[PDB]
């Protein structure tokens, strides 16, 4: 009686961790840390 | 009277300090300080 499936291993409950691990390279940019962010309401912003 | 064992040294009680001093070279590693440490429940971990 060990961890071999034919020797009792079928009683082991399956474990899954739903925390998805992103593997895409992506892209990083830091403009939003230095640039002015204004809130618009229509379709064109006038200053 | 003196510290020689034959002249009154037999009354001096033995002194021992029970803290062991490890002398092995050992091995140092710092991967556990940068690596993710999940906890498992069965025999295989799935993500």
| CA separation for the pair B41, B22 (Å, rounded) | 34
Chain A neighbors of B35, CB-CB under 8 A: none
Extended beta strands in chain A, E state: none
**CB atoms A13 and B41 under 8 Å:** yes
B43 touches chain A (CB under 8 A): yes
Is A21 part of the contact surface with chain B (CB cutoff 8 Å)? yes
The whole-angstrom separation of Cα B16 and Cα A11 is: 53
Number of H helices, E strands in chain B: 0, 0
Q: How far is CA A17 from CA A20, B3, B45, in A?
A: 8, 70, 8
Question: In units of Å, what resolution does this entry have?
Answer: 3.4
Q: A8: which DSSP letter?
A: T
Those residues whose C-beta lies under 8 Å from the C-beta of residue A17, and which sit 6 or more positions away, are B38, B45, B46, B47
Method underlying the structure = cryo-EM
A3 in Cβ contact with A12 (< 8 Å): yes
């Amino acid at each position: 009686m060990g961890l071999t499936k034919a020797d009792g291993g079928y009683l082991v409950p399956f474990q899954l961790d739903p925390t998805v691990i992103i593997t895409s390279n992506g892209s990083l940019n830091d403009i939003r840390r230095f640039a002015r962010q204004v809130v618009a309401t229509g379709d064109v912003w006038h200053g």
